[PDB]
Amino acid sequence: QNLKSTDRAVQQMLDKAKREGIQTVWDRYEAMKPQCGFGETGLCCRHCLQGPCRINPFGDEPKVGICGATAEVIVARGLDRSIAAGAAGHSGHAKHLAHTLKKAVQGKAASYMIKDRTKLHSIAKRLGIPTEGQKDEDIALEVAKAALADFHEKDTPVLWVTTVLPPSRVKVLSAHGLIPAGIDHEIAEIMHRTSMGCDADAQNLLLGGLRCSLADLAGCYMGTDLADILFGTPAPVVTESNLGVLKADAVNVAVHGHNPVLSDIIVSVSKEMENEARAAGATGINVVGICCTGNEVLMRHGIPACTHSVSQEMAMITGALDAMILDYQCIQPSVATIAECTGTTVITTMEMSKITGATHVNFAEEAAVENAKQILRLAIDTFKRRKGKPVEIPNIKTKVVAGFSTEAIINALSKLNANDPLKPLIDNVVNGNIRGVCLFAGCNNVKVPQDQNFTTIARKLLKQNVLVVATGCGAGALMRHGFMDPANVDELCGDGLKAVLTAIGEANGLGGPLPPVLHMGSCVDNSRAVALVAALANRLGVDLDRLPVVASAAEAMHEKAVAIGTWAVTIGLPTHIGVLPPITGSLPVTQILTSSVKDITGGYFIVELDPETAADKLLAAINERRAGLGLPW
């Protein structure tokens, strides 16, 4: 089972599923082999009904699409629709939060409120919305208004791009026409330009894709900003991760999907319902997180993380998961089928994301506390029905220190330098105690043994003194393998990095270091990494493409991860991807994305499936930047 997952709790559940004849994501992958080579290389097009068209990677005909579309056009068009789809998901998320903030300050949804007043005012100030003399509810109205207005064309470009990147970066992107006009505007224009008989120049196509990736960044940043206003900016917290956080004698409820609008409320109400749960024979309600909405409540409330991404079905296989509460994105629809076997109540809550066979409970922000009790009451009923059944919760978990928003990282550093909090970080970059910064982001992928690329690359970078930060299921992978436990700093970290992590943790009075990897939050919270890196660029007076900062989507899966990787490249970072994206069928497109895009944005993709080799390449990219700043490396 070690070939399927490096997670020991997951291996245990794989044996249980095998015993019980429950089919998993790894079984459905095996049954799909060998996979279509035209699709894996990107050489397939179904954009019109004359299709499908395919192109042999090598050999004889077919060599060209029926309408004349070349390999490089087919490959670029497919990549562009992937980016637009990713943009649409982060965008839908952010829009949901904007409507929620508006409803809240309109007296239309009392379960919600302005919790982070300081964040509200600073966002307002960055957007140019006057706060002086204004009611909080009115400033929030204006901020929600601004969020909604960035989805479409208007007199300004998308402000959740132009106001969050340093002016030098914005000017570089404007010079190539890459600043988005509107988030949903860019998505539609991509779908237009990639439809039949439209855009048919690889460079032109890919420039459109860079601009749409910045629409995805906007949606990520907007999501983070709005969730922080509504639910609070994260600060350091300690909790646990992996299947052992389930408790046989509790009502176990997974929150799964993406939007905290839902899960934050589940968390607060579940506390209101402890006695009801106790009456039904449970110790209480055990809320646990899966995928990004689980990261959101881990970051803000210390809710333990159960599992992530590719292994999400295994939480159900324990037999102890009473409910799985979903909103949207990255939920394997297999869970609805598996539920019949495992007794789990799968509940969908959003009108645009249903799963045949799951129970659907409309979630209205207006009725949030009421709807959440209805949902938790299904959970308690389910708990009562497994009275007497044996469960198999692997007794396996790790300790997780998390909650490192950019504000929290700045505050932590401020203990070493109150008026110039970034300076201590930059001092150690310069003296070599910190070689550079690597962001791990994105998914697990069934083609890669689960977490093997994230932990292999992270180990080699940490030994090399790289400051490692993580989000989404990259954070999931590293938390489940101990990388967020400060007790593993001695084992994992090079001396220089250890020194810095220890110097900062001591100064935050905890007699021990920060953890080996800093968990910066959900995948929209990749925007936090951007804020940090942009703050560093600004403090240094250089652009981002001169900083010794890289990203790694080491086991990428979702269209969203493709969108994130592309905007990492667009804002100037060397960006590793550890799964093959469908571009290998076109050497010209590959060459653009791994090399000449350096001349446009200064970032570039690093395609490398071998994790030790990837680590080497990421170190070389870091050290090259070090060299360009005139530092030793």
Q: Is 81 in the site for its own copies (CB under 8 A)?
A: yes
CB 499 within 8 A of CB 433: yes
Site for ligand FES in 53-82 (CB under 6 A): 54
Q: What is the nearest approach in angstroms of its own copies to the Cβ of residue 440?
A: 17
Q: What is the nearest approach in angstroms of its own copies to the Cβ of residue 535?
A: 30
Q: How many residues touch ligand FES (CB under 6 A)?
A: 7
Q: Is 46 in the site for ligand SF4 (CB under 6 A)?
A: yes
Which span (162-170, 292-300, 439-447, 508-516) binds its own copies, by CB under 8 A? 439-447
Q: Is 53 labelled a binding residue? A: yes
Which pair of tokens denotes residue 378?
Answer: 């299904």
Site string for ligand FES, 551-570 (x = CB under 6 A): --------------------
Which span (7-15, 51-59, 135-143, 403-411) binds ligand SF4, by CB under 6 A? 51-59
Give me the residue whose beta carbon is nearest to ligand FES.
39
CB 494 within 8 A of CB 461: no
**How crowded is residue 385: how many other Cβ atoms within 10 Å of its Cβ?**
12
Which span (120-128, 191-199, 227-235, 501-509) binds its own copies, by CB under 8 A? 191-199
For ligand FES, which is the closer residue by CB, 44 or 530? 44
For ligand FES, which is the closer residue by CB, 46 or 278? 46
Q: How far apart are CA 551 and CA 67, in angstroms?
A: 38
Question: How many residues comprise the chain?
Answer: 633
Out of 120, 330, 489, 532, the residue judged to bind its own copies by CB under 8 A: 330
Q: Is 85 in the site for its own copies (CB under 8 A)?
A: yes
Q: What is the nearest approach in angstroms of its own copies to the Cβ of residue 486?
A: 33
Q: Computed from CA positions of residues 69, 70, 73, 77, in that sequence, does the dihedral angle turn out positive or negative?
A: positive
561 touches, from ligand SF4, ligand FES, its own copies, none (C-beta below 5 to 8 Å by class): its own copies
Site string for ligand FES, 27-56 (x = CB under 6 A): ---------x-xx----x-x-----x-x--
Residue with tokens 């928003």: 405
Q: Is 330 labelled a binding residue? A: yes
Q: Euclidean distance between the first and final Cα of the chain, in Å?
A: 40
Which span (65-73, 465-473, 500-508, 619-627) binds its own copies, by CB under 8 A? 65-73
Q: How far apart are CA 240 and CA 399, in angstroms?
A: 5
Out of 27, 67, 115, 417, the residue judged to bind ligand SF4 by CB under 6 A: 67
- CA R_g for the chain: 24
**How crowded is residue 338: how many other Cβ atoms within 10 Å of its Cβ?**
22
Q: What is the nearest approach in angstroms of ligand FES to the Cβ of residue 45?
A: 8
Q: Is 443 labelled a binding residue? A: yes
For its own copies, which is the closer residue by CB, 104 or 557? 557
Phi, psi of 178 (to 5 degrees): -95, 0
CB 606 within 8 A of CB 614: yes
562 touches, from ligand FES, ligand SF4, its own copies, none (C-beta below 5 to 8 Å by class): its own copies
**In this structure, what is the dihedral angle of CA atoms 471, 476, 478, 482, given to the nearest 10 degrees?**
130
Which span (226-234, 330-338, 413-421, 611-619) binds its own copies, by CB under 8 A? 330-338
Tell me which residue of 530, 508, 510, 534 sits closest to 521, measured CA to CA.
530
Q: Is 121 labelled a binding residue? A: no
Q: How far apart are CA 266 and CA 261, in angstroms?
A: 9
Out of 122, 353, 359, 538, the residue judged to bind its own copies by CB under 8 A: 353
Q: Is 556 in the site for ligand SF4 (CB under 6 A)?
A: no
**Hey, which residues does 399 pair with through a beta bridge?**
240
Q: Is 196 in the site for ligand SF4 (CB under 6 A)?
A: yes
Q: How far apart are CA 523 and CA 292, in angstroms?
A: 7
For its own copies, which is the closer residue by CB, 148 or 235? 148
Dihedral class, residue 55 (left if φ above 0, else alpha if ψ from -120 to 50, else beta): beta
**How crowded is residue 595: how many other Cβ atoms within 10 Å of its Cβ?**
11
Q: What 3-state DSSP class applies to 56? A: coil
CB 10 within 8 A of CB 307: yes
Q: Is 51 in the site for its own copies (CB under 8 A)?
A: yes
**How crowded is residue 330: how many other Cβ atoms within 10 Å of its Cβ?**
25
Which span (146-154, 259-267, 504-512, 529-537) binds its own copies, by CB under 8 A? 146-154
447 touches, from ligand FES, ligand SF4, its own copies, none (C-beta below 5 to 8 Å by class): its own copies
Q: How far apart are CA 35 and CA 18, in angstroms?
A: 23
Q: How far apart are CA 25 and CA 33, in angstroms?
A: 13
Q: Is 473 labelled a binding residue? A: yes
Does residue 34 have a cis bond before it (omega within 30 degrees)?
Answer: yes
Site string for its own copies, 356-375 (x = CB under 8 A): x-------------------
**Residue 122 burial (CB < 10 Å; 0-12/13-18/19+)?**
middle
Q: Is 181 in the site for its own copies (CB under 8 A)?
A: no
Task: Enumerate residues 6+ apart whose C-beta is below 8 A from 267.
Answer: 255, 287, 297, 301, 303
Which pair of tokens denotes residue 124?
Answer: 């307002």
Q: What 3-state DSSP class applies to 344? A: coil
Q: Is 481 labelled a binding residue? A: no
Which pair of tokens denotes residue 450?
Answer: 């689960």
Q: How many residues touch its own copies (CB under 8 A)?
A: 98
Out of 35, 50, 204, 431, the residue judged to bind ligand SF4 by CB under 6 A: 50
Site for its own copies in 553-612 (CB under 8 A): 556-562, 579-582
Q: Is 206 in the site for its own copies (CB under 8 A)?
A: no
Q: Is 631 in the site for its own copies (CB under 8 A)?
A: no
Q: Is 53 in the site for ligand SF4 (CB under 6 A)?
A: yes
Breaks (C-N over 2.5 A) in the chain follow: none
- Buried residues in 286-324 as b, exposed as e (16+ CB within 10 A): bbbbbbbbbbbbbbbbbbbbbbbbbbbbbbbbbbbbbbb
Out of 19, 117, 152, 176, the residue judged to bind its own copies by CB under 8 A: 152
Q: What is the nearest approach in angstroms of ligand SF4 to the Cβ of residue 510?
A: 42
Annotated binding residues for [Ni-4Fe-5S] cluster, as ranges?
258, 292, 330, 443, 473, 523
Which residues of this chain interact with ligand SF4, rule CB under 6 A? 45-48, 50-53, 65-67, 69, 74, 196
Annotated binding residues for [4Fe-4S] cluster, as ranges?
36, 44-45, 48, 53, 67
Which residues of this chain interact with ligand FES, rule CB under 6 A? 36, 38-39, 44, 46, 52, 54
